[PDB]
Amino acid sequence: PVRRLPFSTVSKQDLAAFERIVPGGVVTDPEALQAPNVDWLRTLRGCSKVLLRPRTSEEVSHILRHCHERNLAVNPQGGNTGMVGGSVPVFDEIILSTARMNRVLSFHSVSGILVCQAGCVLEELSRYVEERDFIMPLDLGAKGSCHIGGNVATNAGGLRFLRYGSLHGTVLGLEVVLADGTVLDCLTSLRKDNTGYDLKQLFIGSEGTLGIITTVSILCPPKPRAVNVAFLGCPGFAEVLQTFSTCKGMLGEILSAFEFMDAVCMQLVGRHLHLASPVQESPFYVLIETSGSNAGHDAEKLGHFLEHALGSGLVTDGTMATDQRKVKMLWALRERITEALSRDGYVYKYDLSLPVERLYDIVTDLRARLGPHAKHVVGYGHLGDGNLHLNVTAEAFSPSLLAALEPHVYEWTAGQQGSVSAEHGVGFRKRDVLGYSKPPGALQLMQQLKALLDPKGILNPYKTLPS
Amino acid sequence: VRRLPFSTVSKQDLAAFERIVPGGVVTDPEALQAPNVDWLRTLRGCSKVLLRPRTSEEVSHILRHCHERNLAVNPQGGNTGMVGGSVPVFDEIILSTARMNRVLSFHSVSGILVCQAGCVLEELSRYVEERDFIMPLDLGAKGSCHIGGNVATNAGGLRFLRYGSLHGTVLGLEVVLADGTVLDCLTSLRKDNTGYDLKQLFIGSEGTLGIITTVSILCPPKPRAVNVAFLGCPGFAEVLQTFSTCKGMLGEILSAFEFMDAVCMQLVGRHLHLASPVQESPFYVLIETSGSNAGHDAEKLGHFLEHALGSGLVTDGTMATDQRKVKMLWALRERITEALSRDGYVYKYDLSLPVERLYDIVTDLRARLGPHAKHVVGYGHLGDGNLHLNVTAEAFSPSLLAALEPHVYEWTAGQQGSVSAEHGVGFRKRDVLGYSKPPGALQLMQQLKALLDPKGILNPYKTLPS
Ligand SMILES: Cc1cc2nc3c(=O)[nH]c(=O)nc-3n(C[C@H](O)[C@H](O)[C@H](O)COP(=O)(O)OP(=O)(O)OC[C@H]3O[C@@H](n4cnc5c(N)ncnc54)[C@H](O)[C@@H]3O)c2cc1C
Ligand SMILES: Cc1cc2nc3c(=O)[nH]c(=O)nc-3n(C[C@H](O)[C@H](O)[C@H](O)COP(=O)(O)OP(=O)(O)OC[C@H]3O[C@@H](n4cnc5c(N)ncnc54)[C@H](O)[C@@H]3O)c2cc1C
């Protein structure tokens, strides 16, 4: 059981200070604070008594200045779609929301450089840049709710990572407010700049424990002229792996996504979201996207790829689409898996990097190990990046099932020299299992970084680093 | 400017170093001459000790000793850096990675390379290309630069347009801190969000925060087809429109877009005796493509050239897919920096500017100095907004320096640009970062330096302001 650290509490005088700093941006009604206190999975509830919703970087600076002087803990929050308990308070930390920091500052129609506030919603930024023939360098199933500042803070991966890479590469600059309210200006909207240390990198993946991101400068790829999606049934995981290998060999540079899911995933999306499968029933499914400049060439590459995959028995049934409507329908089958799982019951969630050759082994194992105690066990995700999403559903949480899952799943991953948190990050849930993926000396340097940047520890206590 | 109060190497220090790295203690004064002079040959240190460790543990024991004794250390790779970062200012110990040159592993499927910091870039390219992979970066200094130095300087280079930053392609680092502590961030995972991305601090840290000893890096697959078009353009408006059309018509196969002006071509012909393959033009553009289907690439290139030649964007062009002729065309661009240093004294600027006004400073400087310069040239990575600006003179003039500085830095700042796009900061640029970075940023940089190396023994006098 975690113990509340000796922070102060919010007084009426603090509430009047916040009303001065952000007029109309202070929410205190207990019924209104219910939702922002509960995480996306609905298995964690905080006891925060104040939600602050600033509009500007200066307002965030003044809020944190006040909290630093008063020794008040702060819980940054974006879209609240995070999966690891980082997004809601543990006790009574002030919820500092970016919901109203949702303005675009500038967009350069030649460089493709976007500069916008941290609370812009990913899907809305995609619509904005696509109107100008660019795309966001990342996409994820949470796009409708997650904030760009949240994506940077968690170092979100997602569905086009294989093509455009990490936020560590695509973020050009950040504005960050530090714990004492210092505005750190690293908002360098330049493709290249080697003038000292890359300070912004510290805040990518730091999950709001080192500062609050208020403005983001991000490189947007050009919008592809041609997008294709193929959705394929494979008769086993070995054929999934050869379909991936063959796919890289025959599609090459136009590959923009490679996702897999198992039969149980398909059944749950069908059962809870009523989405019919467009291919024959198979034990594994694969979604492939391509993105390129020449429709004709991409079609020829894809045509030959399918022919060879179908010819050599890697794929048993497959369908292809270019019409935007049909493309979105195929993508829904993968994107909405996470929703279908949470409608199925209580979800035990694991987000692992493993050797691609052994990515599905743990799923087969756990189906045997838990038996009928698990309502379902699934494996899916970013196979091209070595990333498995392992989930177990049950009618209700149980201590018996948790004891079967942990530490067994984490030991498997360490045995494979894998990551116990591939993309979702650490937050509250995984803060004490980092030893399975990171050595002690690295963990200590992280602690020193935290002490340097937030010596009072008012920013997101109880998370990201070990206790 | 003035030597900080570090200890001096005694006879007992030499004997300690001989125990730690037997055979790797060079004290011969004639042998120390070359490692004390930077690549441009305008800076020269007075170090009397060169250490050549073989392993990471040897590096750790050296720094433990240097930390206890308060001796300054100057890490050195291939010594091709351009900003005086790689050579001592006074009598700093030169720690060379020259002997840290082994490949440790290479996964033939994932393309993940683990190697020691002193592996030469050219040699790593050879190694992974024999296995159908390529390095994610390439530079004109490939023959000499070390992968450790590339990571320490956050090198950009000639295929950055396609594969992007080392901040993205580097998967893991082993770093030895100033006190000897071995920091293990040598993960080989594509995705790992288990805490802070500590390795990122050392990419671009220029040896002031730790010595990189091992690098893990993601190698892209080797392309089936590489094409190079070397094109002559009748003006910079056409250079910019050739770039725009190139992105629309070549797209995802594009792997390089470089430009150079007429004077650059003249200088490589004069000093290096390399002939131009196209008609004389005011500007030249080198376009590279890399793709998986050679026929699709050739069709894309065909339609692009036809349109560019047809619309007057390009006047004359030559294409190559043969490896020998591709290197010939590339040599015309890669060897400009060499041709300039043979033209006389070189004033060198490496700027990030809006692409639409990348060449304006070249035109401005030509009017501003007129006959007081020998040549003013502009070339470089136009696709990434990165201009290499050089002025040559028959000899150095404090006058010409006063005309160039601060003027060039102020122009760049007026464009919200970077006064060092690629080459970094080192000794030369430590006091001009204010044109690209605000004081609060520079202050936090100093706080990180104080945390990781409180004694300041690693690379004094560089990277951060005085
Ligand atoms: C359906 C679904 C699909 C998903 N798919 C993916 C996927 O493919 N890949 C992936 O990586 N993740 C995925 N996620 C989780 C992912 O982390 C979030 O979707 C997103 O990255 C977080 O954005 P947010 O604004 O919701 O952040 P929040 O949940 O609000 O917060 C995330 C963390 O960052 C901190 N934080 C938030 N905003 C800021 C800020 N401005 N400055 C500093 N710290 C801040 C918070 O305190 C918290 O610790 C998915 C989630 C869902 C529900
Ligand atoms: C012809 C030519 C072309 C070039 N082209 C480019 C180009 O296109 N793009 C570009 O970005 N640069 C370019 N450069 C310069 C570039 O910075 C270096 O060539 C390259 O980055 C590798 O440097 P190096 O191994 O020679 O390191 P050095 O010059 O030896 O060292 C550079 C700096 O890094 C530090 N350092 C070196 N090794 C380590 C280590 N293991 N750990 C910690 N710190 C270390 C040194 O202390 C120093 O501050 C070019 C140089 C030349 C001569």
Author numbering:
A (entry chain B): 53 to 519
B (entry chain A): 54 to 519
Quote the original article:
Crystallization of D-2-HGDH in the absence of any ligands yielded crystals of D-2-HGDH in apo form. Structure of the apo D-2-HGDH was solved at 2.20 Å resolution, and structures of D-2-HGDH in complexes with D-2-HG, D-MAL, D-LAC, L-2-HG, and 2-OG were solved at 2.65 Å, 2.80 Å, 2.62 Å, 3.00 Å, and 2.80 Å resolution, respectively. The asymmetric unit contains two D-2-HGDH molecules with essentially identical conformation. In the apo D-2-HGDH structure, there is no metal ion or ligand bound at the active site. The structural comparison shows that the binding of Zn2+ and D-2-HG does not induce notable conformational changes at the substrate-binding site as well except for Glu475 which adopts a different side-chain conformation to interact with the Zn2+. In all the D-2-HGDH structures, the FAD assumes an elongated conformation with the isoalloxazine ring in a distal position from the AMP moiety.
Human D-2-HGDH is a member of the 2-hydroxy acid dehydrogenase subfamily of the VAO/PCMH flavoprotein family. Regardless of their promiscuous metabolic origins, D-2-HG and L-2-HG can be converted back to 2-OG by two mitochondrial enzymes in humans, namely D-2-HG and L-2-HG dehydrogenases (D-2-HGDH and L-2-HGDH). The active site resides at the interface of the FAD-binding domain and the substrate-binding domain, and consists of the FAD-binding site and the substrate-binding site.
